[PDB]
Design a protein around this nucleic acid. Structure first.
Ligand SMILES: [Mg+2]
Ligand SMILES: [Mg+2]
Ligand SMILES: [Mg+2]
Ligand SMILES: [Mg+2]
Ligand SMILES: [Mg+2]
Ligand SMILES: [Mg+2]
Ligand SMILES: [Mg+2]
Ligand SMILES: [Mg+2]
Ligand SMILES: [Mg+2]
Ligand SMILES: [Mg+2]
Ligand SMILES: [Mg+2]
Ligand SMILES: [Mg+2]
Ligand SMILES: [Mg+2]
Ligand SMILES: [Mg+2]
Ligand SMILES: [Mg+2]
Ligand SMILES: [Mg+2]
Ligand SMILES: [Mg+2]
Ligand SMILES: [Mg+2]
Ligand SMILES: [Mg+2]
Ligand SMILES: [Mg+2]
Ligand SMILES: [Mg+2]
Ligand SMILES: [Mg+2]
Ligand SMILES: [Mg+2]
Ligand SMILES: [Mg+2]
Ligand SMILES: [Mg+2]
Ligand SMILES: [Mg+2]
Ligand SMILES: [Mg+2]
Ligand SMILES: [Mg+2]
Ligand SMILES: [Mg+2]
Ligand SMILES: [Mg+2]
Ligand SMILES: [Mg+2]
Ligand SMILES: [Mg+2]
Ligand SMILES: [Mg+2]
Ligand SMILES: [Mg+2]
Ligand SMILES: [Mg+2]
Ligand SMILES: [Mg+2]
Lengths: 155, 188, 260, 131, 167
RNA sequence: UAUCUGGUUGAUCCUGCCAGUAGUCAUAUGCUUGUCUCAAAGAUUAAGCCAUGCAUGUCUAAGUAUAAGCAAUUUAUACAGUGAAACUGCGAAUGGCUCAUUAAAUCAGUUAUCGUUUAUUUGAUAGUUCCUUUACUACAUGGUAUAACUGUGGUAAUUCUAGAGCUAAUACAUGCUUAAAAUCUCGACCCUUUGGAAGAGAUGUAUUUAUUAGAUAAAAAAUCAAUGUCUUCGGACUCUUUGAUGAUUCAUAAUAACUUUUCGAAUCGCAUGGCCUUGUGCUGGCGAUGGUUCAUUCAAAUUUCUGCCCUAUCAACUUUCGAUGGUAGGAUAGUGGCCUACCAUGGUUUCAACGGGUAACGGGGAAUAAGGGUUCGAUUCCGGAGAGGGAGCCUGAGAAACGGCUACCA
RNA sequence: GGACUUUUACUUUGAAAAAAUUAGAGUGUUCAAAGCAGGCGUAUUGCUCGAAUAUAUUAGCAUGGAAUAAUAGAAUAGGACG
RNA sequence: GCCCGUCGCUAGUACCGAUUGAAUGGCUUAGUGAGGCCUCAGGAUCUGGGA
């Protein structure tokens, strides 16, 4: 989520060991590192064009993506730089030979390279433990908004 | 012993979780080195599987490196002047990683003038060559030159003294330096 | 729970050993070594349960403490020492040389080999890395370290190994149509060439195998042990050549051979 | 900590305890083959029952199905082996038939009598159990 | 019968925690410590016994003390300890300066000396020769493999440059 | 292996339950009990309490022998056989037992470590150690202080131990060493160029920090700052070197330094041989124990996805005193609100949160046989938890250990 | 190797997969419950077949299918291909 | 003929109920706080700033 200020903490936000020599007069001020997480996920330009710092970003930060790759729909965006998705699924009861609707809510970190709204289907990649509960990271937005601009005024 | 299990601590629902098993050692924690300044005192602590961790308590020298100058010297550590985590660390001059310290400058002076032939602030054959070789490269930087006058340089502890018994850092440069300077004075 | 386990309940024992249900309670716990637990055959089980040479285990120490038996050339005197796939057991008395190479059912077989083929082994390299001071090394499925190997050598390739000295004298790249021995899963001990591999980035490449009976089957890559060119194995295969017949097919072969 | 010694029982008992007809039926058999127990009849009909079961379960699988052919043949070759199943009816819809006395007619008890040598189903017993 | 313990002060008893390497306690197990009663190191009339050691000899001899003298039981066993109980320099050669304790079998009187350790001998020197031997030999041997691989790679390069000129 | 029967009425057909019937690796109890084989067994109630004995110790040619021990013989005047005691080393963290707690916990199947530790077994791996660097540092090998033992003692009492006198090391604590080469910084002198130099030091591995390399997505150019190699002196640079992964700041390497400086054999058993300038010179055989880093193996620790019995006479729950997230740190083997600062206001819930109950350890499985089901699993295997209850910790590679210690409670 | 890809349910075959238990093949423990043995000769100097197969579902992985049932698409064109 | 309730006897079960009733178990406020561990000191002694 981040937005504005970027240098808004008590500590200086920077990328580890990405020294920029001040002697060397340069036109871009800050040298910035990045990668592609692989598995086929484009490292969106807003990660390379970005100036945010998030060490928990899978493109600009020091996290690796491995283990389960999951999709689920976004249902909470109130946590600064993280969200809560719901993954629905039917569950088979034998004896009755039918299923029942179930769900779980997975908490997952979301880098300022994505701009996620409630309702967006999102794909996340499993993580090293990143917080008390978050074990996933938003790796791609599948959605958009859900035709919001096609909710405008009158003729 | 301090335990770092998650088995206490409510679950995301807010549930209270019954105690399953007694504390294990392998999930242990220990108390902070809260390392201070002056006169070497280091206590080695025996960690999991052989392995020593070195607890610093009191330290006066540390190895500090001017990055854009490509060198490292070991200076006295003058004191702690800003800490992003806690002010009691600054007030009580506690050395931890990320602490901003002041160091000594006169090793970073002795080297500079002996490598550039310029002197900050304000006759050999080969040296004259070398000194004249360098420059267009001696041009330092305003807010780092001005610090040598004072005799003290701003530098961020970059190691973990409570772990390695080393209190090591880098001189504050460019962006970073400006940052902490802005903080330093708009609170001074 | 508190430290390394040091016992093995007979029943937890691996089943391709063919230990019997009664007559005890424990089975020999395979020592730490070059082969993993659940894919090994401990000296005690070979000298006694296969070769029938010893009667007790107590006799197996007596046999061994005479430095009679030696694995891959070195002597070895550990009643339970983990012997395993591709290794070379040798009884110096009796002139006998063996190789540990899998059945079809999936078990280790008593397979006699020549006095000269017993002087080298095959090893699947399990990784290759850059070591300290820039020296590159390969590591085989039996935990051998070999400094300075061929640049063309990469992970999954098998490798001929001296035994006498340490070195590699040849390798075989993992290419479509190369002789494969299957080391794991239910298709364990079958043999068959390679059709092609399924990629699957981020876990478990499959390898499509076909034997010399135009039969097909799949295992996880890790379960594939390269061992030559179609026809040409670089080691003598046991009888039955790892083909696997139907229960019906097998019954017939067994009940066709009957006229005393 | 030892392996379980496995075991099973070998007989099963009539659902209805007092069926006058099944009782007459049973007693006769005993009298014919020199049995002492109604259990010795229970045992066999229990053997028969399970055999019939496997015979059922097989004959619902397709004709010329692998398991059906393997295990089905096997079943017959065992039955013929002891002389319960007729050489003619060698295809297990008559194992599905079958019946108790076909099993009874083959015990040592009986054979020792059937071909002379005892001249009484009881003498037959007495002789055997006396080495 | 509780013992005293140097430097508790106090003229009473207390219950200290004791460890490896300390008075009035013998650990039964590695890192074992046991809580035990201890008598103070200040003499009261509650003591059963004073233990004392003479430092200066008074004007008169005491019977079983100054009059009688008891030999030290064992003599120097490690090399340079002999060389210092007799003061010898690394010249004199121990072997004949070792102590020698006679003893009798009844009609066979015997002779038994220690077993000098840290004695420099041919056998030791042969192992010192072997160590320095192996280190160098391995070092050279290892250098050759280095160069042999450096060749494999040098004449693999001129194989991607006769292949890059073939086409 | 798809069956029913007795009981409501005067009789009738229903509904419906009660009774009969059969099995139970399902416990008891009663009567009766001859033969072979097989063999469960203080789970249930009281994870209640326990007399006594036992259940953990251990030595190879090869760490330590002046036993004032035995044996004597067979060469051993340092030692040499055998060997108590004791030192040192390893083990006691396995095993055995039990099912108290435990309901998203454990457990299962399936994942993750690019998030760590790992005695051992197996495979590799160390020419660098000193010093202002000709009158040198033990390397033909440096230091004591201790058991056992001897002797003097103390207490009713224990695997209590004190004062005195000895003596070992693979215990303790020290401390030398070795080829050539190249590269780096310094630079005494000389001379003006385009510039070059004798010789001085530094450079094992580990540790800590900062900096750089670690390319590759198809191809080319100009210019600034430094500055590499070859002159056919305007100038060119031509061959130009690259590991793995789906992915990394990876493996590995380079620079400036940092360290109460990790490791780099003061160890042991067998044989005794070459080789001349005849020094007991210089060499040298098989293999034990060790030793750093790497790998491997035995492991461990966390960890993804999904799955639990009854309960709403439990509807809201979670942030006192962390509840959900961000930043920094500290702590740890290491990730992580694990803990602390600061900041924010979040997290869960009728798809049942939270709470309660369980005469709840979870699985592999057991009992019942048309099928669908229903009931059960303390208990031979795997996982987990515990050692009267709690907490704490020493040792150690591994324990929050109980046939270890410390404390409180009983 | 680059550049991008509407989401699902179902079903198929398959990989990964502890043993003991269960189903079940082979074998005459004298029979049997069992067990995993055993069987052949030159029974004076060894020959030899075994120690199968099946079930293993819910979840996860891999692959074939495109019916049935969901989903998203282009209407203020902010459309689609160049 | 059947049949309803008060009332009366015997026995049994459960309910309400003064006793601000009793007991066991699990969590827990506040107060007091053992002990080991870390840490500031200390220095019986015993050597070369350390133990
Ligand atoms: Mg927030
Ligand atoms: Mg073992
Ligand atoms: Mg993988
Ligand atoms: Mg010695
Ligand atoms: Mg009636
Ligand atoms: Mg009636
Ligand atoms: Mg009437
Ligand atoms: Mg009933
Ligand atoms: Mg009990
Ligand atoms: Mg029991
Ligand atoms: Mg002796
Ligand atoms: Mg255990
Ligand atoms: Mg001392
Ligand atoms: Mg040592
Ligand atoms: Mg480049
Ligand atoms: Mg590369
Ligand atoms: Mg690195
Ligand atoms: Mg000689
Ligand atoms: Mg209630
Ligand atoms: Mg945080
Ligand atoms: Mg709130
Ligand atoms: Mg409900
Ligand atoms: Mg319970
Ligand atoms: Mg159970
Ligand atoms: Mg249960
Ligand atoms: Mg119970
Ligand atoms: Mg425990
Ligand atoms: Mg008890
Ligand atoms: Mg408590
Ligand atoms: Mg305990
Ligand atoms: Mg006990
Ligand atoms: Mg125990
Ligand atoms: Mg399937
Ligand atoms: Mg089988
Ligand atoms: Mg009261
Ligand atoms: Mg503290």
């Amino acid at each position: 989520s981040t937005e504005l200020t970027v240098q808004s903490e008590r500590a200086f936000q920077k990328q580890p060991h990405i020294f920029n020599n001040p002697k060397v007069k340069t036109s871009k001020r800050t040298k910035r590192w990045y990668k592609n997480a692989g598995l086929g996920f484009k490292t969106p330009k807003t990660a390379i064009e970005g100036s945010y710092i998030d060490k928990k970003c899978p493109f600009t930060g020091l996290v690796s993506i491995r283990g389960k790759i999951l999709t689920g729909t976004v249902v909470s965006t109130k946590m600064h730089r993280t969200i809560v998705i719901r993954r629905a699924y039917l569950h088979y009861i034998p004896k009755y030979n039918r299923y029942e609707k179930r769900h779980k809510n997975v908490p997952v970190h979301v880098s300022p390279a994505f701009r996620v709204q409630v309702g967006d289907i999102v794909t996340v990649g499993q993580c090293r433990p990143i917080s008390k509960t978050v074990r996933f990271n938003v790796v791609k937005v599948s959605a958009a908004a859900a035709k919001a601009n096609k909710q405008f005024a009158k003729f | 012993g301090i335990s770092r299990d998650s088995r206490h601590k409510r679950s995301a629902t807010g549930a209270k979780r019954a105690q399953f098993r007694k504390k294990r050692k392998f999930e242990l924690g220990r108390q902070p080195a809260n390392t201070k300044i002056g006169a070497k005192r280091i206590h080695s602590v025996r960690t999991r599987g052989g392995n020593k961790k070195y607890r610093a308590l009191r330290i006066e020298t540390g190895n500090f490196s001017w990055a854009s100058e490509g060198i490292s010297k070991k200076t006295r550590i003058a004191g702690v002047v800003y800490h992003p985590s806690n002010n009691e660390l600054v007030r009580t001059n506690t050395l931890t990683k990320a602490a901003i310290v002041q160091i000594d400058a006169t090793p970073f002076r002795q080297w500079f003038e002996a490598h550039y032939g310029q002197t900050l602030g304000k006759k050999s054959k080969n040296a004259e060559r070398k000194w004249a070789a360098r420059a267009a490269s001696a041009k330092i930087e305003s807010s780092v030159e001005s610090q040598f006058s004072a005799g003290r340089l701003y530098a961020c502890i970059s190691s973990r003294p409570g772990q390695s018994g080393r209190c090591d850092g880098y001189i504050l440069e460019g962006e970073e330096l400006a940052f902490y300077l802005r903080r330093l004075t708009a609170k001074k | 729970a508190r430290g390394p386990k040091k016992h093995l309940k007979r029943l937890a024992a691996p089943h391709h050993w063919l230990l019997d249900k009664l007559s005890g309670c424990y089975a020999p716990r395979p020592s730490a070594g070059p082969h993993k637990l659940r894919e090994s055959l401990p000296l005690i089980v070979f000298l006694r349960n296969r070769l029938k040479y010893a009667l007790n285990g107590r006799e197996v120490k007596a046999i061994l403490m005479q430095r009679h038996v030696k694995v891959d050339g070195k002597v070895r005197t550990d009643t339970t020492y983990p012997a395993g796939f591709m290794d070379v057991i040798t009884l110096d008395a009796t002139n006998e040389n063996f190789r540990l190479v899998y059945d079809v059912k999936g078990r280790f077989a008593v397979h006699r080999i020549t006095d000269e083929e017993a002087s080298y082994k095959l090893g699947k390299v399990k990784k290759v890395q850059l070591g300290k001071k820039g020296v590159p090394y390969v590591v085989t499925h039996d935990g051998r370290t070999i400094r300075y190997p061929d640049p063309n050598i990469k992970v999954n390739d098998t490798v001929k190994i001296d035994l006498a000295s340490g070195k590699i004298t040849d390798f075989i790249k993992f290419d479509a149509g190369k002789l494969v021995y299957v080391t794991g899963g239910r298709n364990l001990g079958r043999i068959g060439t390679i059709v092609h591999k399924e990629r699957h980035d981020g876990g478990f490449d499959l390898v499509h195998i076909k034997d010399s009976l135009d039969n097909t089957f799949v295992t996880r890559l890790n379960n594939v042990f390269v061992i030559g060119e179609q026809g040409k194995p670089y080691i003598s295969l046991p009888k039955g050549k790892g083909i696997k017949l139907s229960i019906a097919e097998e019954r017939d072969r067994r009940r066709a051979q009957q006229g005393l | 900590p030892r392996a379980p010694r496995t075991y099973s029982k070998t007989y099963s008992t009539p659902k209805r305890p007092y069926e006058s007809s099944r009782l007459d039926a049973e007693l006769k058999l005993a009298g014919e083959f020199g049995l002492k127990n109604k259990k010795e009849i229970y045992r066999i009909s229990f053997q028969l029952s399970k055999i019939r079961r496997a015979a059922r379960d097989l004959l619902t699988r397709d004709e010329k199905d692998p398991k059906r052919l393997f295990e089905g043949n096997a079943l017959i070759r065992r039955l013929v082996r002891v002389g319960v199943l007729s050489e003619d009816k060698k295809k297990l819809d008559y194992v599905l038939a079958l019946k108790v006395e076909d099993f009874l007619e083959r015990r040592l008890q009986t054979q020792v009598y059937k071909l002379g040598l005892a001249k009484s189903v009881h003498h037959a017993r007495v002789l055997i159990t006396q080495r | 019968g509780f013992p005293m313990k140097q430097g508790v002060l106090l003229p009473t008893r207390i219950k200290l925690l004791l460890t490896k390497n300390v008075s009035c306690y013998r650990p039964r197990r590695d890192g074992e410590r046991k809580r035990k009663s201890v008598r103070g190191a200040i003499v009261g009339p509650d003591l059963a016994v004073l233990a004392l050691v003479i430092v200066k000899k008074g004007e008169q001899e005491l019977e079983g003390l100054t009059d009688t003298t008891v030999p030290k039981r064992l003599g120097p066993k490690r090399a340079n300890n002999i060389r210092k109980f007799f003061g010898l320099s690394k010249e004199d050669d121990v072997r004949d300066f070792v102590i020698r304790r006679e003893v009798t079998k009844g009609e066979k009187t015997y002779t038994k000396a220690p077993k000098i350790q840290r004695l420099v001998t041919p056998q030791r020197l042969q192992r010192k020769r072997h160590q320095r031997a192996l280190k160098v030999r391995n070092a050279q041997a290892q250098r050759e493999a280095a160069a042999e691989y450096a060749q494999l790679l040098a004449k693999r390069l001129s194989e991607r440059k006769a292949e890059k000129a073939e086409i």
